[PDB]
Amino acid sequence: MTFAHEVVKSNLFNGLTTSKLRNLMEQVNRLYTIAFNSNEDQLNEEFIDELEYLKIKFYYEAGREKSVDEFLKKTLMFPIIDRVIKKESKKFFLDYCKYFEALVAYAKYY
Amino acid sequence: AHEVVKSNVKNQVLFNGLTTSKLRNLMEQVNRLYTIFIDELEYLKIKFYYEAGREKSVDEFLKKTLMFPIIDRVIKKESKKFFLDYCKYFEALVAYAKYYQK
Amino acid sequence: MNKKNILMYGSLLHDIGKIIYRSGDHTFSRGTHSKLGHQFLSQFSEFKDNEVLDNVAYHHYKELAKANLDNDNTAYITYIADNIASSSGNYTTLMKDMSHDLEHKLSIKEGTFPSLLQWTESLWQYVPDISLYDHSRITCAIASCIFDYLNENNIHNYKDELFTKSFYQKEAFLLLSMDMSGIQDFIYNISGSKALKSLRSRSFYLELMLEVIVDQLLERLELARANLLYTGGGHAYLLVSNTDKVKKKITQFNNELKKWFMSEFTTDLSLSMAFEKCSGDDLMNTSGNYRTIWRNVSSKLSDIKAHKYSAEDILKLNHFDRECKECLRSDIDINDDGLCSICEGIINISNDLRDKSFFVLSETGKLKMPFNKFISVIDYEEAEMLVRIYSATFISGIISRTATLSRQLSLFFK
Amino acid sequence: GLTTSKLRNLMEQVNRLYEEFIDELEYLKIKFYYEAGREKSVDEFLKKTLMFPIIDRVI
Amino acid sequence: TKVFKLSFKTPVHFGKKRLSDGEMTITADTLFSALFIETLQLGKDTDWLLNDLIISDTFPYENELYYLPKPLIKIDSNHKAFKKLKYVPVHHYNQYLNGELSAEDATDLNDIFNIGYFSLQTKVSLIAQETDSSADSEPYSVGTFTFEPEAGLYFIAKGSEETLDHLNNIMTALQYSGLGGKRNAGYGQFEYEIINNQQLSKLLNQNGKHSILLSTAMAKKEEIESALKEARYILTKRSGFVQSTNYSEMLVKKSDFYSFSSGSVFKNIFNGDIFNVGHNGKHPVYRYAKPLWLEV
Amino acid sequence: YSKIKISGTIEVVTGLHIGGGGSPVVRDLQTKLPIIPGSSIKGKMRNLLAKHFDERVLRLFGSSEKGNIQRARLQISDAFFSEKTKEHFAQNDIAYTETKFENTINRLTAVANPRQIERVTRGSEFDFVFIYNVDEESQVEDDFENIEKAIHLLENDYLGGGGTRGNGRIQFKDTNIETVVGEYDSTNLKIK
Amino acid sequence: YSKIKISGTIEVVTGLHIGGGGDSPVVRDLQTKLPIIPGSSIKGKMRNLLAKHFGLKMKQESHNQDDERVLRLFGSSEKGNIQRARLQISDAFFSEKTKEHFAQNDIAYTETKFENTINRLTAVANPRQIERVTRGSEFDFVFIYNVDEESQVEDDFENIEKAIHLLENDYLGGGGTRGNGRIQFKDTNIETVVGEYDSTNLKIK
Amino acid sequence: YSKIKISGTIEVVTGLHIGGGGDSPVVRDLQTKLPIIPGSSIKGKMRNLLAKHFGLKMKQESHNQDDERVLRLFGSSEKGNIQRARLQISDAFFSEKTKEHFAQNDIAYTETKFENTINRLTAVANPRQIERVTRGSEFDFVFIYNVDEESQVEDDFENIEKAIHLLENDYLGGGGTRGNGRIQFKDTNIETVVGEYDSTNLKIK
Amino acid sequence: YSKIKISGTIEVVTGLHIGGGGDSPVVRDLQTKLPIIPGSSIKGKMRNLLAKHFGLKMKQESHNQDDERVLRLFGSSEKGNIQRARLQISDAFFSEKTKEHFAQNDIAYTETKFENTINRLTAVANPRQIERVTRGSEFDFVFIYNVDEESQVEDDFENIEKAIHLLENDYLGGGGTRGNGRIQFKDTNIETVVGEYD
RNA sequence: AUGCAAAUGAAAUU
RNA sequence: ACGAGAACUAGUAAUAAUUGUCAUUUGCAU
């Protein structure tokens, strides 16, 4: 599979660097433990609002810098996030965390 | 939140050339109230009327957001949690407004 | 002294002088062992018999050539028997020990020939592949057979009769063999709690039955223990005289034995004896016919065990309390604790086995013996107070040499 | 200068795991790449011992 | 003249003298008495199968090979491997009878003689005062036999057709009762099948000068003297108890009997008889002595 | 005179230990597989039925050592592993026998000694067959009444050694009553 | 001849390590791969505890000779005065109800407590990994009682009651004073499965 | 023969971090996913405390060989002696009241606190993230006492309250030198669960 | 064996930024929603200042082996020798009078400071934000000194006086170089709680 | 706003 | 009318006993 590798090795992303994802990473990591703490798979509406604000921050960060914008567009982050919000299943969120983490770890490797 | 901003993109102009610099004072207003009183909300409304009088584009932005009824209902509820929810909403509006710009 | 006893005592010491000759320190007549042995044996009161001295001094061709003996004089027989049979200080020590045993342990009587055989066996067992002990015994056995054969055949002028090859060719020897039937089932019919004690006593009981049988047989035939060649397990072999009297008496003893054995168990143990003629020429490995005659007597013994019981015997067998716990047999009549009289005697003899060594054959005893006798247990002091005391390789090989091989095997396993 | 102490998480994950399982293996390789990136000795150990190809082979 | 084939599938104990003893083949005394007891259990009419049935001893079989007990003949040659041999396969039967068997062939035949294994099973007895109070148990050992999945025993019987049909009825009834030692203890059940082997029948239907006794026989009073003119035979003391005669089993015991074995050779045939060994009994107890001969 | 054949299968609820070998367990010497010898069945059945109360036992099982002779009217043979349990274990890759390590605790010293004991793997099935030879027409019902209780009693007991310590419970399934010789009907007797 | 059946369920309070297997595992069946509670452990723990309840003298300590009544319930029959057992203590098995519950809610059946074994001076802190059956698991158990004497049943039951009680304030398994292996009893059931003796007047807390 | 129970509540003054399961987790159960305090570390710490309070020699420190009365209180049974401990210590579990309080006030149970380490002559910081229980939390604990001798209770109990005191001005858990692990005890209760002994004059501070 | 408590108050004079929660927040207790000063911070600052005050070799810096006086006073147990810390440092909290005085006077606990940046050759102003702890507030702390040798107690207490002096003369937390961290000590208290040794 | 995402150790005696 | 016949490889007792996931390392340079 290594879908993360495909984009990272292809591009870096017109000057992409790891610290340019810190808060984004931070935000994701926050939701991670938050997603860990929940028992049921059904996502609470407060967690939905967390997802929505994460989408908002994604867009703001993409507008702030062009290289991060190219990364998010080229890694399809926005449609993936939208689908995740639509499905409202925790396991798919954990898989998304794993995919994004693979992206981050790869991008740190190169 | 996203819907109002993306659907108000007219031919491109956003609320006829709305810019975040004009929201500065309004932004600051919310920011202070974010750290934190009914009279404070009344003065927030007064500043909303002030900034909508400053520019017609901002007045349209506030009307097309139904901001005034929202603020009235927030004041009626007197609940700080609903105040925080409105803060989230206004932040979303500001962000999407930033996103859809020249 | 009965001339048979003279024959015995002379033959058993016929070639003694060798032990003096190789002694070196006792070589009075360093010309020949015969004269030397005669001189040494001429020192003793008990063995002061003269004809025995003549026998000893006159066992060889040169010696007999000029002795001018009578036509009827036993030593000549010894001659043929000898012919048929076929550090230094240690020897001096043996001379001292033999003088001691001869002055203090040996005496001349009708039944003292076994004493001579026992002491000579004690002494010469490794005095030469042939020990002197085996040589003396075989010479004596052969002389016994020869003397019985010639006296029975009304022949007395032996010097003219023998002093040869034709006599060698005459079938004057008989091979008789005995076979015990039911070793295995009689030894392995134990089920009680005294397994070891019963087992060890039954084994010795069967062994002593065999030994008492052979002793009674040899005694009745007036024959000696020299003629016994091997006993053990159930197989046992005797070389006896090829005479009509001998065959008849063998028959009669066989009949009486069978009558008893039918009287005791009726299946569990039975004895089969078989006899076949041979001549002296066959014992000398002349053409290896010795193995042939042995295999023949083996075949005969194998083929007499087929038809064992005649018509009347079985007819009675069919027309005539419960099983002993220790002895798996019902026919014998049980008593207290469900134990039979004979098997209870077995328990008694087992209890007496460990602490006592001598066993005495008498009229009352404890255990039942073949010829209306019994066996009891005594001690050496008690024994003195009473004063019988009991204390391919086979065939192919490479009489004396196979006999000594059997004796070696027996002594190793015993 | 490799130390077993720098392998702990990886070993732990192995002990944890010793179609969802395929995703677990993918996460294994993700953390493997991350550890190799973190330390140079771990990177050499993984690369020269053919860890990545055998990991892919199992998957 | 049909023959029956038996498979056991259960351990079975045969017994010779003691419970720890095991036998593989039994004699027509045990078999015929089994036939008698099952006939009486059936409530049938016994005269027909008593003085009209001819039965031989049982012999073991393998996958496809059949065996007979050794003939006690005088062969003139080792004298050892033949002694170490107990049974003869049907294939070389006449070869042995004409001496066409060699030492190596006999060695091979002995090698293929693996037809089952013997065992001793231990047991205890707690019917004793262990029921009542402190008392040590009373262990015993028993012997059992286990056959390989393609082994068993087979008979030979001959007679009139009505007798033989009655024999088949008795065989069906007996197939579910036992045929051994401790039957009621869990040993000795079997299933039968009737097979006509051409070679065995051919062997049965020869003609010669000698005779080989395949059952347990004993000549009557007036002919034995003519029976034993030239013979090689073996005696076997047959003893044992009886079933359903008098009050005490320990008190009741068949008188000792002596009989010829199943390897004997005769010149003059004798017809045998069923001899009573009964005394102080409410019914006679019959022992079987009626010979089934092999004439070659 | 007829013969009733009574067959079925029996399950191992808890591990079982017959183990005449010990501490090993009884088997067959070539198939290397466990058996449960019929003598053991008989002994337990005799013990329970006798402890239930005699004439019914002696008739049923046979003594003939007490001055009178009765022939055993019931024959019990061994049992064996079914094919169903065999394939079930083979496909699922489960060993046939379990090995339990035990321990013994000394007092005033508090030192521990080890033990090593084999047991049957739970859940297995055995196929069994009994034969009843009807010699008396008007009694078999009572006799079968007895045999009913027999299994019932054994249902709530154990087989083998160490039973009180918690092993040996067995179960009975698939019981059918058939007549195969004679002309006596077998459709009204029942065994659970 | 009556036989009495007791049925009920044992609930793990805190981690349990019976562990006859030796990674310091617990005993498991080879058919289901689930936790089990061996009967010999339950029986002997109750036996030892009830023996040490009353008098247990040094001479009594020497030979495992104990009180006549606990000897009555658990059977001794070792030397001389034979006493055949009276209680057949059957096992507990990992219940299926909790199997469904955990499977739905995605809980493993076993936790691995990682601990330390530090010393003094050298203070070698050896890391440890003890496997335990996670709390909330339930097992089903059955006991069997034989009535050797009718009039003695009540006291017999009385005695085993104390045993139940004492065990409820104690532990099974190892590491006992360190916290492991406290249990509770729940949902009992008593029934005279065979015979004609009424089991209504019985109760087991 | 009796069992004396000691019940109470652990109030965590500052942070507590056991972390046996390990960014850097704490030890937590699986049925409820709420933090717990095991008996094991509690026992080890109190034992070393009471050992240092009494004698402790280098040869004594070599192989965990300690003073005799501490041995009686905690059991060794190694040097050919029969010494089973008289004190059974439980794990400590997240209480109902505290979880309710943090539910009704919206406070997470866990904080992830970030630390830095500064390398010498480099001035480059290495960051760390440690998971610790938020303050004000309370656990429950229960202690079990065995009376092996009637003339040996109070003195050991005296030691135990001394031991408690030594804990109250020390730390239970990891990294206490840097200011986490301070605890306190509240609401001590002393009852004899089984037996005929009085627990009225017996107290632990 | 004994235990002597050390109790006292630290007063903040400048800004105080510890920012463990790090637009740049301050650590806060979730039971009170108020900032704190980690015990780790006090101990680490003290250890660094005393190590600099004593011998600080480059090789010793490379090997992180601390001076024997510091190593005994705060514990290392890192060179394979058993070395338990003789001193315990805890967190610190607001005083009651501090909170009362601030609540009565309508004065907030945090100050927002805008940090204006000018870039060389470019002069681009991008404002930054930072929070600071209000000066004039006081915290209460607790240290614990455990007695293992009855003789060197005075030496350790004198070294602790040197500790208090140096920490008063230096900065605590973040923003030290630009003027945040200057704190003082008041109302030091010594009162043994366990033992007979005072 | 800009660097920081870990570091180090460690089954025993019946 | 079979070396037959009656015959639980039983009954007592468990992985027990001691061991601390701890020891140091500043949310901080611009």
Tokens of C311: 């018509």
CA distance C165 to C280: 9
CB of H130 under 7 A from strand J? Answer: yes
Chains G and E touch (3+ CB pairs under 8 A): yes
In degrees and rounded to multiples of 5, residue I95 shows phi and psi of -85, 155
- DSSP H helices in C354-398: 380-386
Radius of gyration of chain E (CA): 21
Strand J proximal residues, G:106-135, Cβ < 7 Å: 116-117, 124-128
Amino acid letter, residue H17: H
**A57 interfacial to chain D (CB closer than 8 Å):** no
* Helical pair A90-109 and A22-37, crossing angle rounded to 10 deg: 150
Residue F12 and residue F122 in contact, taking contact as beta carbons nearer than 8 Å: yes
Judge contact between F146 and F73, C-beta under 8 A. no
Cβ-proximal residues to E165 (8 Å cutoff; 6+ apart), any chain: none
Say how far apart CA I9 and CA I32 lie, in whole Å: 20
Indicate if the alpha-carbon torsion angle C103, C105, C111, C114 is positive or negative. negative
CA distance D34 to chain A (A): 6
Strand J within 7 Å of which CB atoms in A 7-66?
17-20, 22, 26, 29
Question: Is C303 in contact with E74 (CB distance < 8 Å)?
Answer: yes
- Distance in angstroms: CA H87, C1' K11: 36
Taking Cα atoms as reference points, which of G144, G163, G48 lies closest to residue G90?
G144
Element at E13 (helix H, strand E): none
Residue nearest to nucleotide J14 (CA to C1'): H78
Annotation-wise, does F177 bind a ligand? yes
> What's the alpha-carbon Rg for chain C, to the nearest Å?
24
User: What distance in Å separates the CA atoms of residue E96 and residue F116, rounded to the nearest whole number?
Assistant: 55
CB-based contacts of C118, cutoff 8 Å, min separation 6: none
H22 contacts: CB under 8 Å, gap ≥ 6: none
Helical packing angle, E28-42 and E161-174, nearest 10°: 90
As a whole number of angstroms, the distance between CA H53 and CA G178 comes to 22
Calpha distance C7→C77 (Å, rounded): 8
| CA–CA gap between residue F106 and residue E235 (Å, rounded) | 63
Contact B92 A63 (CB under 8 A): no
Residue range E1-62+115-204 forms a domain whose CATH class is: alpha beta
Using CA atoms, how far apart are residues H87 and H43, in angstroms rounded to an integer?
9
Among C290, C250, C293, smallest CA distance to C84 is for C290
* Residue F18 · residue F37 · CB < 8 Å: yes
Cross-chain residue pair C330–E74, CB shorter than 8 Å? no
Interface test with E, best of G78, G81, G82 (most E CBs within 10 A): G82
Q: Which residues, other chains included, contact C291 with Cβ-Cβ below 8 Å and sequence gap of 6+?
A: C395, C396, C397
Question: Is the CB of H84 less than 8 angstroms away from the CB of F108?
Answer: no
**Residue H151 carries which DSSP code?**
G
Report which residue type is found at E221.
K
Of C306, C332, C337, C308, the C-alpha closest to C321 is C332
Residue at F128: amino acid letter:
F
Q: CA distances (Å), H161 to each of A110, H6, H8, H50, H199, in order?
A: 60, 12, 13, 11, 15
Q: Which residues lie across from H12 on neighbouring strands?
A: H183
- Cα-Cα-Cα-Cα dihedral of I131, I135, I139, I145, to 10°? 100
Q: For residue C179, count other CB atoms closer than 10 A to its CB.
A: 19
What are the φ and ψ backbone dihedral angles of F83, each rounded to 5 degrees?
-65, -35
Phi, psi of I117 (to 5 degrees): -115, 135
The CA distance from E252 to F68, in Å, is 12
Q: How far apart are CA D37 and CA D15, in angstroms?
A: 22
Structure tokens at I164: 């208090």
For residue E56, what are the contacts with CB-CB under 8 A and spacing of at least 6?
A: E28, E155, E156, E157, E214, E215, E292
Angle between helix axes F38-51 and F140-155 (nearest 10 degrees) is 100
Of I48, I4, I39, I13, residue with least CA distance to I145: I4
With vertex at residue G199, the alpha carbon angle to CA G194 and CA G201, rounded to the nearest 5 degrees, is: 170
Tell me how far apart the alpha carbons of residues C190 and C185 are, in angstroms, rounded to a whole number: 9
Beta strands in chain A (DSSP E): none
Query: Contact, I190 vs I5, CB < 8 A?
Result: yes
- Which strand J bases fall within 7 angstroms of a protein CB? 1-14
d(C-alpha H113, C-alpha I40), whole Å: 11
Strand J and D43 CB separated by under 7 Å: no
Q: Are G34 and G92 in contact (CB under 8 A)?
A: no
Q: Which residues pair with E260 in a beta bridge?
A: E235
Encoding tokens for residue E16?
Answer: 């010779």
Q: Which residue of F has its CA nearest to H82?
A: F109
Would you say C248 and C241 are in contact if contact means Cβ atoms under 8 Å apart?
no
Of A2, A101, A105, the CB nearest to D37: A105
Angle CA G36–G37–G40, to nearest 5: 135
CA distance I43 to I46: 5
Q: CA(I66)–C1'(K30) in Å?
A: 29
CA–centroid distance for F192 within its chain: 14
For tokens 């006592």, the residue is C356
I176 touches H at CB < 8 Å: no
Using an 8 Å Cβ cutoff, are E188 and E180 in contact?
Answer: yes
Which nucleotide has its C1' atom closest to residue E183's CA? K2
Q: How deeply is H121 buried, as exposed, middle or buried, from its count of CB atoms within 10 A (0-12, 13-18, 19+)?
A: exposed
d(CA G171, CA G182): 5
Q: Which of F57, F60, F71 is the best residue to mutate to test the E interface, defined by the most E CB atoms within 10 Å of its own CB?
A: F71
C1' of J2 to CA of A19 (Å): 9
Total residue count of chain H as it appears in this document: 205
Contact between residue F144 and residue F189 where contact means Cβ atoms under 8 Å apart? yes
**Residues found in chain I:** 198
- Asked if residue G190 belongs to a known ligand binding site, the reply is yes
* CA angle in degrees (0–180, nearest 5) for C101-C104-C105: 60
Experimental method: cryo-EM
| H135 CA, J6 C1': Å apart | 24
Binding site per annotation, positions of E: 80
- Which residues have CB under 8 Å from C50's CB, separation 6+? none
The pair phi, psi for residue F71, each rounded to 5°, is -90, 135
Bridge partners (DSSP) listed for residue I174: I17
Dihedral (Cα; H96, H102, H104, H108), 10-degree rounding: -130
Residue G92 identity:
A
Instruction: Give the number of other Cβ atoms within 10 Å of residue C283's Cβ.
Output: 21
Show Cβ contacts of residue B70 under 8 Å, excluding neighbours closer than 6 positions: B86, B89
Do residues C86 and C284 touch, judged by C-beta distance below 8 A? Answer: yes
Q: Which helix (H) or strand (E) holds A65?
A: none
The DSSP-derived string for H88-136 is EE--EEE-HHHHHHHHHHT--SEEEEEEEEE-TTT--EEEEEEEEE-TT
Instruction: Output the DSSP codes for chain G.
Output: --EEEEEEEEEESS-B---TT------B-TTT--BEE-HHHHHHHHHHHHHHHS---HHHHHHT---HHHHHHH----SSS-----EEEEEEEE-HHHHHHHHHHT--SEEEEEEEE--STT---EEEEEEEEPTT-EEEEEEEEE-S-GGGHHHHHHHHHHHHHHHHTS--SSSGGGT---EEEEEEEEEEEESS---SS----
Residue type, C241: S
The answer for A90, left when phi > 0, alpha when psi is -120 to 50, beta otherwise, is: alpha
Q: Which nucleotides of K are covered by protein (CB under 7 A)?
A: 1-30
Own/partner long-range contacts of E192-200 (Cβ < 8 Å, ≥24 apart): E192/E4, E192/E5, E192/E6, E192/E7, E193/E4, E193/E5, E193/E7, E194/E2, E194/E3, E194/E4, E194/E5, E194/E168, E195/E3, E195/E5, E196/E2, E196/E3, E197/E3, E197/E66, E199/E90, E200/E3, E200/E66, E200/E90, E200/E156
Tokens, residue B42: 């009344």
Would you say E73 and E230 are in contact if contact means Cβ atoms under 8 Å apart? no
Resolution of the structure in the document, Å? 4.1
Judged by C1' against the alpha carbon of F21, the nearest nucleotide is K9
- Structure token pair of residue H82: 């029969």
Tokens standing for I177? 């170089």
The Cα–Cα gap between C177 and C311 comes to 25
> How far apart (Å, rounded) are the C-alpha atoms in residues I113 and I129?
6
- State the pairing for strand pair I28-29/I110-115: unpaired
The overall longest dimension of chain F from CA atoms, in Å, is 70
The domains of chain B are located at 2-99
Tokens (6 digits) for E24: 């593989």
Buried b (16+ CB within 10 A) or exposed e, I128-167: eebbbbbeebbbebbbbbbbeeeeebeebeebbeebbebb
Nearest to F54 by CA among F46, I27, A107: F46
Helix, strand or coil, per DSSP, at residue C243: coil
The one-letter amino acid at F183: E
Amino acid symbol at I169: N
| CA dist., res. I102 & res. C106, Å (int) | 140
Q: Tokens in use for F185? A: 């009907």
Q: How many CB atoms lie within 10 A of CB C128?
A: 11
Extents of the domains making up chain E: 1-62+115-204, 206-296
Query: CA H136, H138, H139 angle in degrees (round to 5)?
Result: 155
The dihedral over CA atoms of C242, C246, C250, C251, expressed in degrees to the nearest 10, equals 100
Which tokens go with C266? 């009726």
